[PDB]
Amino acid sequence: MTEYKLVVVGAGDVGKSALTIQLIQNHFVDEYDPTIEDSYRKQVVIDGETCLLDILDTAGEYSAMRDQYMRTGEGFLCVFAINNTKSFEDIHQYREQIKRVKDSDDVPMVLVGNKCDLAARTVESRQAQDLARSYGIPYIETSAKTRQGVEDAFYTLVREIRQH
Ligand SMILES: Nc1nc2c(ncn2[C@@H]2O[C@H](COP(=O)(O)OP(=O)(O)NP(=O)(O)O)[C@@H](O)[C@H]2O)c(=O)[nH]1
Numbered sequence: 001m002t003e004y005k006l007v008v009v010g011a012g013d014v015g016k017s018a019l020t021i022q023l024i025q026n027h028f029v030d031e032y033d034p035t036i037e038d039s040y041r042k043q044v045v046i047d048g049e050t051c052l053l054d055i056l057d058t059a060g061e062y063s064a065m066r067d068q069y070m071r072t073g074e075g076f077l078c079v080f081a082i083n084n085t086k087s088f089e090d091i092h093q094y095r096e097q098i099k100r101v102k103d104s105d106d107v108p109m110v111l112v113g114n115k116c117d118l119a120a121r122t123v124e125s126r127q128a129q130d131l132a133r134s135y136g137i138p139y140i141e142t143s144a145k146t147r148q149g150v151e152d153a154f155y156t157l158v159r160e161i162r163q164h
């Protein structure tokens, strides 16, 4: 079956595990986050295509084994939290790590501004749109809490993989 291997990266506590578990289990993780990084699989229909997603949840430095885990990704979600400025600034470092590991400057990737249920945001949508457009990648706002945008972010990443 058609399989899309996706990897979720970004700074601590931006919601990588929460986005992943929302996609897989439709559940919002409140207190019990996996903390230990794992791989999750699910058969979904994306734009009429039945396919399998394998999602690797990553930890929020450099490791040869982490490169080995990341090298298997076909596409990447770079997640920040819209109420945490440092996590947005950190996006540059995660994108640099992907480019190195994939040996490419055009890796299928989506910028994810998570926690968009929080109207008390420190990163404005316009700033993230600017950054995304300068990278040449989509930008999607998500909430793992309300589930808004969650499937949109993963499926848009699949679309980027398809057209690469
Ligand atoms: N309000 C709100 N809280 C969220 C959202 N996503 C995650 N959270 C909360 O943010 C905290 C961090 O989430 P978590 O999934 O553990 O993030 P992480 O990026 O996996 N952290 P780590 O880097 O330590 O693995 C949790 O308490 C979670 O409930 C969201 O969209 N909205």
Ligand SMILES: [Ca+2]
Residues within 6 Å of the ligand: 002, 003, 004, 005, 074
């Ligand atoms: Ca594949």
Ligand SMILES: [Mg+2]
Residues within 6 Å of the ligand: 016, 017, 018, 033, 034, 035, 057, 058, 059
């Ligand atoms: Mg986590």
